[PDB]
Amino acid sequence: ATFDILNKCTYTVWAAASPGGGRRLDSGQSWTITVNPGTTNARIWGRTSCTFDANGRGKCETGDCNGLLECQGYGSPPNTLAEFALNQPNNLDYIDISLVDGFNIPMDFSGCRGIQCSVDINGQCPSELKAPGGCNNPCTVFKTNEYCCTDGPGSCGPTTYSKFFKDRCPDAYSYPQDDKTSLFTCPSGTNYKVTFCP
């Protein structure tokens, strides 16, 4: 599938993708990439307040991926995530927005359907979760089963912290096993758009 990633934010967002790399997107700028069929574990995100040298090495305030402009792996929370797995059994793509790795930039992720998390989550973030330039999931900050779901299927459920996210962005994953209301499919052959600050 092709993904068009567009920055509508008034500030620069350094877009990233696993797999795909990364690009500086000033306001209004787009980057289009191809992710091949069968790819799983994939994600697109944006990074805020980056500094990079002439070789693309540096650091971002949110979503940094091992200090590279061109990501070769996942970023550091908090980062709003567009997650996808392509061309899975029965020709289904599995898509979602996740806040399980935190929020940093409001996002729209569209394909056969539009999913959005566009609220001022940073401005309303609980003091327990606040991070420079974003809002961490409780699981990232507090390493307990109640937030992280490590103890098996059904061992965790919504918490006052997951609900902070879920009340505001009902369609995104708010805790690791938030599947029934956050996991979507599109028929395979769909193409996608990720928009920052929709």
Residue numbers in the entry: 25 to 222
Question: What does the paper behind this entry write?
Answer:
Despite these low concentrations, proteins have a great technological relevance in winemaking as some of them, the grape pathogenesis-related (PR) proteins, can aggregate to form a visible haze. Among the grape PR-proteins, the thaumatin-like proteins (TLPs) and chitinases can undergo changes in structural integrity, particularly under certain conditions such as when wines are exposed to elevated temperatures during storage or transportation. In this paper the crystal structure and some physico-chemical parameters relevant for the haze formation mechanism of three isoforms of TLPs isolated from grape juice were determined. Plant TLPs generally have three domains and a cleft located between domains I and II.
Despite sharing the same sequence, the two VVTL1 isoforms, I and H2 exhibited differences in their chromatographic behavior, a feature that allowed their separation and that also indicated that they possess some differences in physical properties. The physical differences between these two isoforms of the protein were also observed during crystallography. The initial solution for this structure was deposited in the Protein Data Bank as 4H8T. This initial structure included data to 2.0∶Å and an overall R value of 0.224. Domain I is the largest and forms the central core of the molecule. This domain comprises 11 β-strands forming a β-sandwich of two β-sheets. The two β-sheets are stabilized by four disulfide bonds (residues 33–224, 89–95, 140–213, and 146–196). Domain II consists of a long α-helix (α5) and four α-helical segments (α1 to α4), and is stabilized by four disulfide bonds (residues 146–196, 154–164, 168–177, 178–183). Importantly, disulfide bond 89–95 connects domain I to III, while disulfide bond 146–196 connects domain I to II. The comparison of the two structures performed with the algorithm for protein structure alignment and comparison named TM-align tool indicated that the two proteins have a root mean square deviation (RMSD) of 0.78 Å, with a TM-score of 0.98, indicating that the proteins belong to the same fold (thaumatin), confirming results previously obtained with CATH.
